Design an enzyme around this catalytic site. Sequence first.
Site, PDB file in Angstrom:
ATOM      1  N   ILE A  38      70.347 -48.506  40.573  1.00 20.38           N
ATOM      2  CA  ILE A  38      70.043 -47.632  41.703  1.00 20.38           C
ATOM      3  C   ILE A  38      68.855 -48.095  42.569  1.00 20.38           C
ATOM      4  CG2 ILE A  38      71.321 -45.671  40.735  1.00 20.38           C
ATOM      5  CD1 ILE A  38      68.640 -44.314  39.935  1.00 20.38           C
ATOM      6  N   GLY A  39      68.113 -49.067  42.092  1.00 17.53           N
ATOM      7  CA  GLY A  39      66.964 -49.589  42.823  1.00 17.53           C
ATOM      8  C   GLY A  39      66.192 -50.585  41.998  1.00 17.53           C
ATOM      9  N   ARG A  40      64.929 -50.826  42.392  1.00 14.94           N
ATOM     10  CA  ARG A  40      64.047 -51.739  41.675  1.00 14.94           C
ATOM     11  C   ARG A  40      62.617 -51.354  41.908  1.00 14.94           C
ATOM     12  NH1 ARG A  40      61.769 -57.171  44.380  1.00 14.94           N
ATOM     13  NH2 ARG A  40      63.494 -57.690  45.796  1.00 14.94           N
ATOM     14  N   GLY A  44      61.055 -54.511  37.359  1.00  8.99           N
ATOM     15  CA  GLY A  44      62.461 -54.631  36.986  1.00  8.99           C
ATOM     16  C   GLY A  44      63.354 -53.710  37.779  1.00  8.99           C
ATOM     17  N   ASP A 158      49.793 -49.497  47.424  1.00  9.57           N
ATOM     18  CA  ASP A 158      51.093 -49.975  47.884  1.00  9.57           C
ATOM     19  C   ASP A 158      51.846 -48.894  48.655  1.00  9.57           C
ATOM     20  OD1 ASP A 158      53.024 -52.232  47.864  1.00  9.57           O
ATOM     21  OD2 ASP A 158      54.085 -51.344  46.166  1.00  9.57           O
ATOM     22  N   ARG A 162      59.263 -47.707  51.760  1.00  7.32           N
ATOM     23  CA  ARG A 162      60.097 -48.307  50.686  1.00  7.32           C
ATOM     24  C   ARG A 162      59.792 -47.614  49.332  1.00  7.32           C
ATOM     25  NH1 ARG A 162      58.857 -54.527  48.543  1.00  7.32           N
ATOM     26  NH2 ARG A 162      56.982 -53.481  47.735  1.00  7.32           N
ATOM     27  N   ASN A 163      58.530 -47.184  49.168  1.00  7.06           N
ATOM     28  CA  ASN A 163      57.950 -46.563  47.966  1.00  7.06           C
ATOM     29  C   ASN A 163      57.953 -45.049  47.909  1.00  7.06           C
ATOM     30  OD1 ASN A 163      57.683 -49.121  46.777  1.00  7.06           O
ATOM     31  ND2 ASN A 163      55.684 -49.456  47.717  1.00  7.06           N
ATOM     32  N   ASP A 176      56.736 -44.815  43.909  1.00  7.10           N
ATOM     33  CA  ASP A 176      56.373 -45.987  43.104  1.00  7.10           C
ATOM     34  C   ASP A 176      54.889 -46.045  42.904  1.00  7.10           C
ATOM     35  OD1 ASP A 176      57.752 -48.620  41.946  1.00  7.10           O
ATOM     36  OD2 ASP A 176      55.796 -49.178  42.727  1.00  7.10           O
TER      37      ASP A 176
HETATM   38  O1  LIG Z   1      65.302 -46.361  42.328  1.00  7.07           O
HETATM   39  C1  LIG Z   1      64.751 -45.219  42.284  1.00  7.07           C
HETATM   40  C2  LIG Z   1      63.341 -45.214  42.143  1.00  7.07           C
HETATM   41  C3  LIG Z   1      62.715 -46.415  42.582  1.00  7.07           C
HETATM   42  C4  LIG Z   1      61.367 -46.629  42.579  1.00  7.07           C
HETATM   43  C5  LIG Z   1      60.836 -47.964  43.082  1.00  7.07           C
HETATM   44  S1  LIG Z   1      60.817 -47.713  44.848  1.00  7.07           S
HETATM   45  O2  LIG Z   1      62.332 -47.852  45.361  1.00  7.07           O
HETATM   46  O3  LIG Z   1      60.008 -46.388  45.195  1.00  7.07           O
HETATM   47  N1  LIG Z   1      59.958 -49.064  45.393  1.00  7.07           N
HETATM   48  C6  LIG Z   1      60.757 -50.261  45.781  1.00  7.07           C
HETATM   49  C7  LIG Z   1      60.070 -51.548  45.336  1.00  7.07           C
HETATM   50  C8  LIG Z   1      58.952 -51.567  44.462  1.00  7.07           C
HETATM   51  C9  LIG Z   1      58.384 -52.785  44.107  1.00  7.07           C
HETATM   52  C10 LIG Z   1      58.924 -54.000  44.619  1.00  7.07           C
HETATM   53  C11 LIG Z   1      60.012 -53.924  45.478  1.00  7.07           C
HETATM   54  N2  LIG Z   1      60.578 -52.701  45.810  1.00  7.07           N
HETATM   55  C12 LIG Z   1      60.574 -45.576  42.121  1.00  7.07           C
HETATM   56  C13 LIG Z   1      61.184 -44.387  41.678  1.00  7.07           C
HETATM   57  C14 LIG Z   1      62.577 -44.160  41.671  1.00  7.07           C
HETATM   58  C15 LIG Z   1      63.052 -42.911  41.210  1.00  7.07           C
HETATM   59  C16 LIG Z   1      64.285 -42.216  41.343  1.00  7.07           C
HETATM   60  C17 LIG Z   1      65.392 -42.713  42.083  1.00  7.07           C
HETATM   61  N3  LIG Z   1      66.285 -41.720  42.347  1.00  7.07           N
HETATM   62  C18 LIG Z   1      67.408 -41.996  43.090  1.00  7.07           C
HETATM   63  C19 LIG Z   1      67.665 -43.282  43.589  1.00  7.07           C
HETATM   64  C20 LIG Z   1      68.841 -43.614  44.422  1.00  7.07           C
HETATM   65  C21 LIG Z   1      69.446 -44.818  44.818  1.00  7.07           C
HETATM   66  N4  LIG Z   1      70.506 -44.631  45.596  1.00  7.07           N
HETATM   67  N5  LIG Z   1      70.604 -43.311  45.699  1.00  7.07           N
HETATM   68  C22 LIG Z   1      71.681 -42.696  46.506  1.00  7.07           C
HETATM   69  C23 LIG Z   1      73.048 -43.098  45.890  1.00  7.07           C
HETATM   70  C24 LIG Z   1      74.261 -42.866  46.810  1.00  7.07           C
HETATM   71  N6  LIG Z   1      74.047 -43.288  48.230  1.00  7.07           N
HETATM   72  C25 LIG Z   1      72.703 -43.077  48.882  1.00  7.07           C
HETATM   73  C26 LIG Z   1      71.511 -43.293  47.958  1.00  7.07           C
HETATM   74  C27 LIG Z   1      69.616 -42.658  45.024  1.00  7.07           C
HETATM   75  C28 LIG Z   1      66.733 -44.253  43.255  1.00  7.07           C
HETATM   76  C29 LIG Z   1      65.579 -44.032  42.516  1.00  7.07           C
END
Ligand SMILES: O=c1c2cc(CS(=O)(=O)NCc3ccccn3)ccc2ccc2ncc(-c3cnn(C4CCNCC4)c3)cc12
Length: 302
Positions: A38-40, A44, A158, A162-163, A176
């Site tokens: 779902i993300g990064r 990781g 940070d 994006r965070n 984040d």
């Molecule tokens: O992945 C996450 C997440 C990610 C981070 C890291 S960041 O993204 O804040 N920084 C990014 C970073 C940090 C360091 C280096 C590089 N990048 C921190 C907390 C979370 C927590 C919950 C979360 N909930 C839902 C979705 C989610 C995903 N898709 N959908 C929906 C699914 C369906 N369609 C639309 C979106 C919901 C993604 C996440």
Amino acid sequence: MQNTVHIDLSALNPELVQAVQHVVIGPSSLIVHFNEVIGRGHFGCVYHGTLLDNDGKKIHCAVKSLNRITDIGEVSQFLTEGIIMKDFSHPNVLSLLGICLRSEGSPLVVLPYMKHGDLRNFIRNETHNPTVKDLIGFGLQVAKGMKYLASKKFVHRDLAARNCMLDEKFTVKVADFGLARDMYDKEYYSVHNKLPVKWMALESLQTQKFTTKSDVWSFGVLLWELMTRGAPPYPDVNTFDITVYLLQGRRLLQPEYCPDPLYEVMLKCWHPKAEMRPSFSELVSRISAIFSTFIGEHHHHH
Ligand SMILES: O=c1c2cc(CS(=O)(=O)NCc3ccccn3)ccc2ccc2ncc(-c3cnn(C4CCNCC4)c3)cc12
């Protein structure tokens, strides 16, 4: 193989291990949907997950894991990204659900699931098309989350769109904490042991010292991302050339549909003298006044 990695908890700072134990999640209470990324984060990938609460009810969560497990130092930094969030209790700051660590493999940092995902991709999405007032409202929510964070003496380091995440009620949450540090009674954090050059304050770029006032600078960059609908800052300026560009008094320019009072707030966040920048409490006051006086279409609760 990596699945046989065993972490020696005796090698970590006892306070960290105790903090981890205080938020422990038993492995039988967690299901990681390891086939659904779902993300990064900085350490990781993030996966969909299911937690079983004290009454056996299923809770949809997000699970961060450690991509590389070769040294204790990285394990320590990864657990700290979870641990720094332990006592967070604010509508605009993501809470920690807990930490799962069994005999082998990666520790797992468990967080609430954020329905709409990251703020940056949200505002970039042509469907979503948030109005100018909706964007100012998201900016206000971030300022409220940061006022809370700074009150607890934590420095984010940070802050970027994006965070930030949006939940089912469109509540924006600073999400984040991969680079966040406790300032204790020092009111600063200096690099000892990734850094977002284009979101960093001029003094942090020069001295590598971070404070709430350098978080104010990053906040101003976040506001600019919001008003440009997720445009990359300084696209024609190289990372290594940013320090000189800023020394020369040049700043991010006013976004096309951004109200003049909000651009003035951004410029205050980028004052070359950190002490001259507004506090997060002042930012909440000013942005709230701009939001309440910009009479346009809006769909969300801020
Ligand atoms: O992945 C996450 C997440 C990610 C981070 C890291 S960041 O993204 O804040 N920084 C990014 C970073 C940090 C360091 C280096 C590089 N990048 C921190 C907390 C979370 C927590 C919950 C979360 N909930 C839902 C979705 C989610 C995903 N898709 N959908 C929906 C699914 C369906 N369609 C639309 C979106 C919901 C993604 C996440």
